[PDB]
């Protein structure tokens with residue numbers, strides 16, 4: 153428990169990830185690391201008991217301590233309300249945290265050499281900038297009960313005017329309606345973060361919109377990205393022999409699918425949410441991806457796993473059946489969190505520990521110890537046997553040995 | 566001595582697609598088929614001159630004649646406004662036409678046994694039912710100039726009282742804001758058509774939504790599907806050993822990517838638009854996909870090609886250089902329409918011809934004659950020799966020649 157890590161905000165999750173989260177702290181972290189740990193329990197029961205307040209407290213605690221790591225959480229619908237006897241259908245804690253902090257969420261696969269892909273031609277990593285603010289996460293949606301008029305209006309703060317837009321007039325029957333929004337300054341921050349990540353990896357930058365369909369809404373993103381690139385980034389982009397280009401999401405997803413990778417993909421909030429699942433599965437597992445929210449201050453960071461609570465695996469866990477569930481994405485939330493913490497504190501010891509754990513996971517997988525998903529990439533699902541993989545505990549305990557070995561060997565040098 | 570086809574509505578496109586469209590008419594359709602043809606030119610320059618009225622006329626024609634076929638068109642942005650010197654930025658004819666007719670757009674890849682997929686496991690078709698109505702096509706978006714309150718309001722027709730919801734309060738600077746909607750009845754028709762397609766093809770049906778995030782908007786789609794499923798189609802699904810399941814869009818796309826295919830995928834408007842282009846490309850080309858708008862009446866269809874105008878190739882075609890562009894989607898637009906035109910009139914010849922032009926198009930590619938896109942699928946693009954592919958004109962000729970042979974052989 154020797155390395156002094158400093159202050160880190162921990163957010164505990166639900167279901168299968170919450171079990172993995174506890175195995176991670178016990179086996180891979182607390183033995184080697186002493187942290188000043190501000191822990192917020194985001195499990196569904198404690199959010200219900202606090203009326204979601206713990207979610208907001210955790211977000212403000214991240215603002216203060218500059219780093220947080222988040223386990224995956226249940227976002228309840230009607231069935232979850234009935235399952236846990238909830239008071240309300242609470243909003244996504246991810247959406248709540250992301251809209252307080254702001255910024256961009258970068259998502260990238262975690263690449264092992266022995267792991268085949270689903271998409272043949274990606275030999276270089278694709279990196280998704282996902283705008284983290286506004287759009288669907290922040291939307292206001294409601295059921296339209298019957299005939300009537302749906303309008304969306306804008307009143308300036310002074311208000312010396314009112315601009316009223318017709319959304320729809322429902323002549324017979326009901327339906328649904330929603331408003332949504334984004335902010336210029338958040339878009340600008342989203343652009344600056346996308347361009348800088350391009351130059352940081354030396355790669356070109358594709359931004360995708362619908363702007364032919366939404367002309368004002370998506371046109372604003374295209375305009376903001378083009379103005380900033382023209383004025384600020386263009387000379388720098390040319391000198392590295394890369395470029396920035398806008399593409400319609402239709403073409404963009406087709407291009408991304410047939411390309412070789414090796415590009416930064418700046419997506420709007422909804423697209424990045426959906427495409428990072430497709431991308432991560434293309435490289436062969438949702439268990440292998442990193443998701444790191446980088447805030448506009450260049451200082452505060454929130455790392456997480458981008459996949460969910462793996463309910464189906466949890467259900468087998470509750471019956472005593474063996475599970476094989478991929479912890480790697482969760483482990484990398486900690487390593488991405490501890491590495492940014494070392495950067496802020498100039499802690500070489502912690503920075504070394506974070507990198508070593510990432511290598512141990514990849515080495516352990518490249519050396520043939522893996523969960524069932526990754527073995528299914530190798531053999532195909534119908535060909536995998538029980539002897540072909542390790543259960544969730546066997547795999548954590550294996551990484552435990554290899555992490556002890558790697559840190560022991562390093563102590564002699 | 567031509568087959569009499571009946572009445573078809575034609576909508577003509579722009580750029581590269583408009584060239585291929587004219588090729589298919591002269592070399593493929595016209596010699597063998599006589600048609601009562603109502604031609605509406607949807608080219609961007611005409612839409613400007615008719616103030617887009619040409620597009621509403623074409624849709625009403627589709628209601629009247631039940632059959633239409635469409636070449637891809639330009640939906641202008643500010644750049645296109647400069648290029649064509651447009652009066653306004655016209656909305657998408659595809660959205661305009663879809664929102665008049667209503668329905669589910671059904672999309673599926675065209676499979677030639679010799680063409681490798683980018684995605685390893687899909688050995689069976691993925692058919693995406695795409696809701697054609699509302700959502701992003703009908704949205705009202707505007708620029709927020711500066712600080713202030715954006716609100717969404719519902720005023721009932723019975724005069725009870727107004728509900729006003731706060732969208733956002735901008736306390737510094739501006740942004741963008743938009744409203745959007747959908748209609749219960751349209752969702753019900755989208756549900757019914759998805760359950761029927763799953764039963765006729767015998768495959769499981771998945772619906773994908775965001776319902777954990779939009780709890781009302783997407784919760785409605787999910788409630789309606791589940792209601793109609795249990796009360797109407799449930800016991801027929803169980804009789805065919807297939808199921809209906811709702812999935813979060815996140816989980817769904819990963820489930821589709823790692824599956825072997827063989828399912829019906831019900832998507833909301835935007836999702837169906839994008840996922841259909843990722844799915845076509847996973848099968849190896851945007852050039853082979855069928856897109857049919859199937860209207861709720863069980864009668865009218867509009868057949869199109871889901872891809873765009875292929876502008877990049879059009880710029881090369883304008884340079885006189887060799888363009889290889891895959892006609893297949895535009896051809897299958899005509900055949901899917903004509904097969905429907907034949908199903909209505911019980912015209913057995915036009916039905917034989919429609920399957921012939923599809924059977925020919927697949928055999929020409931499975932014999933080694935293909936456009937560059939499909940050649941890159943086999944050898945990879947850096948390995949593609951000029952000897953591997955025929956250009957746009959060369960390819961449409963090999964089809965017309967194999968078409969002449971296949972129809973000549975069955976006259977007997």
Ligand SMILES: NC(=O)c1ccc[n+]([C@@H]2O[C@H](COP(=O)([O-])OP(=O)(O)OC[C@H]3O[C@@H](n4cnc5c(N)ncnc54)[C@H](OP(=O)(O)O)[C@@H]3O)[C@@H](O)[C@H]2O)c1
Pocket residue numbers: 223224225226227228246438439457458459460461462463464465476477478479481525777813815816819
């Ligand atoms: N970041 C977040 O906090 C976040 C994000 C998404 C979803 N969620 C929540 O998670 C809950 C469940 O959502 P969901 O069932 O739609 O999606 P999910 O549980 O995340 O994933 C569904 C399927 O994806 C596969 N999978 C995902 N991660 C895996 C891993 N690490 N190792 C092995 N397999 C993995 C499993 O495949 P197989 O079934 O094929 O074995 C799993 O059954 C919901 O309450 C949702 O709100 C939270």
Ligand SMILES: NC(=O)c1ccc[n+]([C@@H]2O[C@H](COP(=O)([O-])OP(=O)(O)OC[C@H]3O[C@@H](n4cnc5c(N)ncnc54)[C@H](OP(=O)(O)O)[C@@H]3O)[C@@H](O)[C@H]2O)c1
Pocket residue numbers: 364400402403636637638639640641659851852869870871872873874875876877878889890891892938
């Ligand atoms: N149905 C419609 O009316 C429809 C649908 C979508 C877009 N559009 C319109 O089309 C215009 C341009 O769209 P866009 O530039 O975004 O994309 P696009 O025209 O659809 O095509 C862009 C890329 O897709 C590939 N591609 C698509 N179809 C192909 C084919 N048949 N054969 C060979 N390659 C093909 C090409 O890839 P490579 O460059 O790599 O060779 C091409 O550069 C826009 O104005 C848009 O509004 C119309």
Ligand SMILES: O=C(O)CCC(=O)C(=O)O
Pocket residue numbers: 226227244245246247425458777815
């Ligand atoms: O918070 C949720 O409910 C979904 C979050 C998610 O899917 C993501 O982070 O990509």
Ligand SMILES: O=C(O)CCC(=O)C(=O)O
Pocket residue numbers: 364402640657658659660838871872
């Ligand atoms: O009409 C447009 O502008 C795009 C249409 C499209 O890409 C589609 O519906 O597949």
Ligand SMILES: [Ca+2]
Pocket residue numbers: 425426428429458815
């Ligand atoms: Ca996601």
Ligand SMILES: [Ca+2]
Pocket residue numbers: 402838839841842871
């Ligand atoms: Ca499309």
